[PDB]
């Protein structure tokens, strides 16, 4: 029923935002998988093998069983550490995209809200105009029954009337699909919304453009994310560079074995020389490894990593050049709106003088025909474009907030001042 | 020529649909790849080694040659079975995505079709207007030769006539590019298309809105595909969970081996030691394996898989809301159209009588030709919107079928009767 | 400030292009990582193991220390070669995707450039239009002081004037956002630009449409890319087929080893059985592999690759149809442009004489000045659409180059003295 109240409902169940939130959680949970390789690895394995000999190891043949519990532990390997750091960085980036998606739902709800309000005014002015054209037809049909005017008077007032009847539908339809889209973003239908209140509505000037621009540098989420991705691409070079380095792994195992020799030739061998042996061993061990050369694979991986970093740099610049033109065009548009409003307010008062003076004044004499209707078509156009400009202003205010990256639900809360009058979202 | 006639040719050569179809066949063929590890694995290998020994094994040498045929076979492993299930799931999802894409071709052909028809109307109404303004230039320029009118009217009617010539170009060119759109989809040029039969109409009230909802709910291809994706995500949770489980493998092999010894100090005491052995071995063997701890890896993967499933659920809820917004808006539009047709059908009769009765308003001076000049650009606007709403009605009929998920060839066959009259696509 | 000059600054620092270049430099570098498995792999490793043997393993302990330098070298493996061929293929595709992006920058700068000029023209005429409406408000307010007109005439001269005041602001604001769009591509603000010259202006008819298709057939980068993609798709089939062939690997190594046996059951007195050795080995060795059957995995992989090739085939068709649609749409557009130009060049002379002959019938007094109001809006709207068409034509020249696949810096030079008249971009 009110922008804030609407957003409140929208926020707690918007699937676009909730998907985003689930992406952030998984990203952060993946940190445990990335740390995984640094922690111990425990596993139990067992084996049976029945072999059967032939040719100077012929009549000798055996089946053997074993089982063992293995531990492995990675004392130092730089790749495994970088792998973790990278996932922390990845989860960091996902967090920012999620913050950016919170600001979109704000920016989108308002859009859908103000589109429904706009779709009303459009219909409402058409409505009032349909009647305004009608009253001209009514009078002319009276002024016809008793002489006075031709039929070249009736058909002008009938055509333009039948034109607007069809214009009423395309208008009435827009409102039904403005409301339906609001339901898509919010999750629920609204039979009424708080409309703009001309009594308590002021259009304040924004901070200087160079101050807005300076603030955006600090707080813009698009720009922030680009910095982190460059930070991410940098880290990835180290990872490629880690391939040259030594690695040391601890491994330990407990176990038992049993080989038994039975068969023709091995039915006794010299003096029990058939190795019927039940082994069993606790053992601990270290394995060192160092690459010396791998066909230039590692170097290639570094050089590739360095070029990608150049891309991430050039992407920071793209994000920046984008930020620089979003704060600037957002600034202009407010400065366009205030001017549009101030002009269109006097374009109404001017068109009001043409109504008050040449409409209500046109009872006797002067001019008839087309000069009758336009003294109000101008009054409606100006009235439409004025309310239109007012909503533009409101959205330009929110668009400057998101450029700064500081848009939250308190900027929707400030707009409870501008809204008051509950208005039907139904073509009555 | 006819709409279905056009679609038929498009359907069997369209590269987008056939790219889709091929993607769906790969998806299905991959089930054979995913099944693979469950089947037996056969392979042959061989090795040679020359060992020149120093240190405490100094003055000894060996040649060692071997060859063996290896068979492996997975007895039980859950994750391998999941692999297969997940590809069956993958292929199923692809077939639904292929169906959606069959429906888009129907949708997109009809659109391009009615664009070409639309572009003809625009052009031929601009054409009819061009002559209409011309006849008024002609009459004023000839009533000037007598000297009955001022030069401020022969230049006036010439000014409106030169605007319509320009408008006749950007309308001729629109038709050329509307046809090029239509060729891109179908594959071939068309010199003639069946345009609407402006006599026998098909304005028919659509199903109750909640029945349409009910049917979209269980037949929409987008919503079905979203449902299967969630099913897929859940199936992946179990796959992550499969990490903790034990596995059993068969590995049986036939092979032979040889070792031969040389070098200075190569024997030892009695029996002539370090002798050559010529092994030949038939072995069958099992290998049980059970992880216990893997540094919290599996556990992390199962949390990610759960968080992903949250996203897939929200994705469904998101796809749901889309459908709701589609049927309800396809409903509003098809009702807007129904009513819009009736209004412009009447606004044509209205703007008609304005140039039937005023077709004597130049035959004296009821309303000076200037009035009739810009009265002709009223009967043409009404006639434009009427055809415009008529085609937009036909598209809105398919759009609802699409939203119900049942858009078929029958829908196109039903529109043969609404067509019939062949109309040029390159007029003179 | 001239287009060519503008493009220079843009080209050297545009981040989208420089990202694309870094993408190509990395892809080419990837070839070294692709070739690497074919070259030697060299590595050093060392191992220590302590063990104690429980029961029958006879309380017999050991220390085991070893180190070894190991070389491995692929002798034949077709998959490895095939990996390298695919990477060259991949890098080549990038090169074309970079050539396309060198053309996009030209196309975009020209487009962003002309919108700025266009935004000035819109503003230029709107302002001159405002002086034109004010001209007639100035005179009506004069004619009311002595009292020759109804106060009704004043309001039409004012309420129509305030309308123009309003859409001069949205015209002014349009220019600033046009200059800001332009900055984003170039990185520079431009206070002055070289506007089009009305004389010194081209109108050359394009080559025959069939000649344009024939040249696009063998030079258009989009299908050049699509061809290489398909070429790539095939190369992957042969890669899937490599899975059946034999492989051979050379593996040489140098190393030393040392085991020692402590424990009270070794050092007693018997019975001399367990002895420790310090071994040193020089080893050279070959290893042969032939898969006989891998559970239908390779065959599935080949049949997958075959279907993927059908996709690439069908996408070559998709790419092709677009080209056809593009050259034909761009040919149609240049021919629309010339006609449009000639129409409006005639429709200016037409709107001229309509406010030249009516200009004379003002200084001697004739007809309605309300007619002279609407007459001046249609006098300027020919000028606004003429200069517009003239720019549209110039972009259409470039769109036919992009389609041929030969758009480069020379086409920006050809346009140099075609635009010599400098104009400001922030008029006060
Ligand atoms: Cl290397
Ligand atoms: Cl684990
Ligand atoms: Cl196979
Ligand atoms: K045998
Ligand atoms: K480099
Ligand atoms: K040595």
Numbering used by the authors:
A (entry chain A), B (entry chain C), C (entry chain B): 23 to 450
From the paper:
One well-studied efflux pump is the tripartite assembly formed in E. coli by the outer membrane protein TolC, the periplasmic protein AcrA, and the inner membrane protein AcrB, which uses proton motive force to translocate acridine and other drug-like compounds. TolC is a homotrimeric channel assembly with a transmembrane spanning portion and an extensive periplasmic domain that has two distinct sections: an outer membrane proximal subdomain in which 12 helices pack to form a hollow cylinder, and a distal subdomain where 12 helices form conventional coiled coils that curve to meet at a juncture that occludes the channel for all but the smallest ions. The interaction of adjacent coiled-coil pairs is stabilized in part through hydrogen bonds and salt bridges, and mutation of the residues participating in these interactions causes the channel to become permissive to the diffusion of ions across the membrane in vitro (Andersen et al., 2002) and to the entry of antibiotic in vivo (Augustus et al., 2004). In this study, we have examined a network of hydrogen-bonding interactions at the aperture end of the TolC which, when mutated, partially opens the channel so that it becomes leaky to bulky molecules in vivo.
We have solved the crystal structure of the Y362F, R367E mutant in two crystalline forms at 3.2 and 3.3 Å resolution. Corroborating the in vivo effects, the crystal structures of the double mutant reveal significant repacking of the helices in the distal helical domain that partially opens the channel, relative to the closed structure. The crystal structures of the double mutant show that three of the six pairs of coiled coils move radially outward from the central molecular axis of the trimer in comparison with the closed-state form, widening up the periplasmic lumen of the channel like the iris mechanism of a camera. In one of the crystal forms (spacegroup C2), neighboring TolC trimers pack tightly so that the exposed loop regions of the coiled coils H3/H4 and H7/H8 pair in a self-complementary fashion, and the H3/H4 loops form a hydrogen-bonding network. This crystal form has a greater displacement of the helical pairs H7/H8 compared to the P212121 form. In the C2 form, the maximal displacement of the H7 helix on the leading edge is over 11 Å in the case of the chain B, and the corresponding maximal displacement of the lagging H8 helix from its original position in the resting state is roughly 4.5 Å. We note that a similar interpenetration takes place in the C2 crystal form of the TolC mutant, where H3/H4 helices pack against each other in symmetry-related molecules. It is thus plausible that the shallow intermeshing of TolC trimers may mimic its interactions with AcrB in the acridine efflux drug assembly, where backbone-mediated interactions play a role in the engagement of AcrB and TolC static helices H3/H4. The asymmetry of the open-state structures is also reflected in the exposed surface of the three grooves that putatively engage AcrA.
